[PDB]
Each structure stands twice: as structure tokens, then as C-alpha cells.
Amino acid sequence: MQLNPESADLRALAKHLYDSYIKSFPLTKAKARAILTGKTTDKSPFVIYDMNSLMMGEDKIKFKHITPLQEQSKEVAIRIFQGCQFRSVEAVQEITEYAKSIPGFVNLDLNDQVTLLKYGVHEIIYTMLASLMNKDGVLISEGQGFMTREFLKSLRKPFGDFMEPKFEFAVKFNALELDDSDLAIFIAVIILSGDRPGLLNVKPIEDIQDNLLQALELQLKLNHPESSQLFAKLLQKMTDLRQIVTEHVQLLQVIKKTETDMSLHPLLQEIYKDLY
């Protein structure tokens, strides 16, 4: 490893992605851990751990997505599902905006950009969800709330089965001890995966992911002295992410097939369309 103008560019690329990553997503991992451990001047998330606390929460948490004027299923599982949909729709936009700040992405074929976003979005979502999770639960409503893992497991089938695989994934992933600087490059690597179905102009994509991959390895070698294999361990995680997405799609089809036509937001349909 060397200090040459190549690596200097790698580091400049890392700072750019980080700077953009910070301003593209609301709740960074650094803030989330702080919240998660009480180390914050911020109030403290309202904890939802049973039905009574869920109800008390819907009153005393100001959810970005509801108004006193709409309804609003009677069934808590469906309501929780709906808030998730809204959060995912927002995250798709934050991810798009972030994708556009990746040097070169915006010059790809516009059709390929769509394809990269379609497949990358949920992988990035689950990657970043881990930042909000510990083994007990997950930050919600931009850290205003915290919903416990066991409360999520107790929602009626099938809904009680959506978050569990994400918690399991998070526990393992959080053990990598990545920080936001690491994560900004990693999620860029995900977006620029040249092996997504239907790409038409793969070469320019691989060239960008290549630089991204160098910026990532340099970053992890600089940032994690006590971690001999972080780069490969992290690449392998891109694999478990694809299976999490796949599993999530198959459960999504228990809904729809067996729910009540409590339908998916069209942006979300778009993404799931001919996914896998």
C-alpha cells in the first residue's frame, strides 16, 4: 500500500461519497448508535413493546406520514405495514438522490440507471436498516421511536415474519463494526453492480464499481487496523442481502395473495415487478 496520486484520488472519492451520504439520508449510523445508547441531547425515542405502547405511541409520536384526517386500517399489523411502505418510498428517493452523486453514474445509459436503482434499492435499505437496529429492536420515525423485535414478531401472520430476517442479518452485519465512512462507499458498490439483469452497457458500470471497490478496500484497510479480512467479509454480505431481498419478495406474495388488496404503493410495485 502506497501514497501515490491514485490513492489520493481514492480518498478524495471516499470523502465525496461520505459528504453526499451524510446529506442524502436523515439518520446516520453515528447518530443512531448515540440514540441507541442514550448518549444524546435528543429527547429519547418512545418505546413500543406491546399493544398498549403502540397505541400510546401513535398519539405521542409525530409520524411524518399520517394526519388526523385519513383512515387508517383498524388492524395494527396493516397500519405498521403501511408506515413501512411510506418509509421505503421515501428511501427510494434518498437512494436515487445519492446514486446521482456517485461520480459517473449520471452519465450511464438512463435505462441502465433505472435498472441499477431497481435492484440496488432494497439491498441498500436492509444494509442501512442495520444501522438502526440492535438485538432488541429498531429505531423508527427518524429515531423518534423504537419498536421492539419481539413486538414485531408478535404481529399476526404473515406480518410477524417480515422484520425477523432483517434483525438476524443486522446482528451479524453490525458485528463488522462499519461506520458511516465505510457504509457510504459500500452502498455505492452495491448500486453499481454490473451483474444486474437487463443491463445494456455493462462496461462503463464495471469501470465505476472498480474504482468504488478500490476506494472501499483502501478505506477499510485505513479504518480497521484490527480486521484482517473486512473487505471480503463485507463483499460476501452482498450475497446475504440478495437472499434477504428474495425472501422478502416471496413473503410479499403471501400478502396480496391472501390479504385484502391492501395494495402496494406503485413505486414499490415498479421495483418488485419482474425482480427475480
Binding site: 427510494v92 428517493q93 436515487t96 446521482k100 438512463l110 440507471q113 433505472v114 436503482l117 431497481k118 406503485p266 413505486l267 415498479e270 421495483i271 415487478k273 419482474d274
Partner: peptide, 12 residues
């Protein structure tokens, strides 16, 4: 075409 919203988002 099949991703009209995603197209929009990237075109703005």
C-alpha cells in the same frame, strides 16, 4: 416504460 416513476425520479 415499465418503471415510469423511477424514470421520473432519475430525470429530475
Amino acid at each position: 416504460e415499465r418503471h415510469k416513476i423511477l424514470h421520473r425520479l432519475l430525470q429530475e
